[PDB]
Amino acid sequence: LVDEDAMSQIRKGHDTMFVVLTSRHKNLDTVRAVWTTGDIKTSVDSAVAINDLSVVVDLLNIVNQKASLWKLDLCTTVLPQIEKLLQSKYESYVQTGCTSLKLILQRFLPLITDILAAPPSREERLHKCRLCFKQLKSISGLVKSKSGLSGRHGSAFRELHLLMAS
Template sequence: MSESEAMQAIIRGHKSVLTALAHRRKNLQIILAMWSTKDARSALEQAINMEDQSVIVDILNVITLKPVSWTLDICQILIQPIYDLLQSRYESYMTVGCSALKLILKNFGSTIKSNITAPPGIGVDISREERYHKCMGVYNHLLNVRAFILKRQTLQGKLGRTFRELSILFQNLE
């Protein structure tokens, strides 16, 4: 390959990267606008509907830095996309998925466990029923994620160590 052919190949690749980044930026601007004018739930649902894992990764990178902004609703919305990231072919996506899953297990594991195992109260408690259904939804997804994590914990390196940590965190749900 000559020098000019090599330069042409690089330029073609550069154009496609620029196009992908412009598309990603546009999607993130849409999500940011929704986040500031509506609520986080609507913005996250829109991000998921875009079916662009890079957008989900960018959002998770931001919101995992603020664990106090997470709610059971956010866990319920994001658990499936997190599972999808764990199955990604990109190690960086898997790492972001692991970080988000670790946050869920650390901050919501005891809440989920106590709400799915607690006996029903006396009388009608609508907020408790809603919390129970949210916890059950997250818990059922976590069971699928756990099976995947158990298979992957034999990986070598940093990612394997992270999967082993997650496996230990999953024991708190038992």
């Protein structure tokens, strides 16, 4: 291609890149300022309120690395974000949601099952478990709606369907 053509093709996207990255960094700075308090759930809630999905993804990619930072309460915020990410056109967004979902299932499903199986302070851990179960059931319905036929992210949804077959 000619120089003028190559440069035009390159320059066309620069203004958007600059603005998108500036805004993303501003939003990450806000989230980071809450994160340093050690209140992980409030940090994630702040990211959700800002409603920059790329920042939710970046933050989950961080928290997905250390399951020990997850409290039961955090699942009530993350599960709805997983459902949203599982409907993304971006394979990497789906993958981030799948990773968060696998972490939650491995860390909290036994506890959730124990709490919900108990016979009729403590009513707060029970309340959180009941909410997590309904949110997990919602994701289960989504995965089942998407795995009967191999779709855009068929491989990821086949794996999720098998994992959640319980």
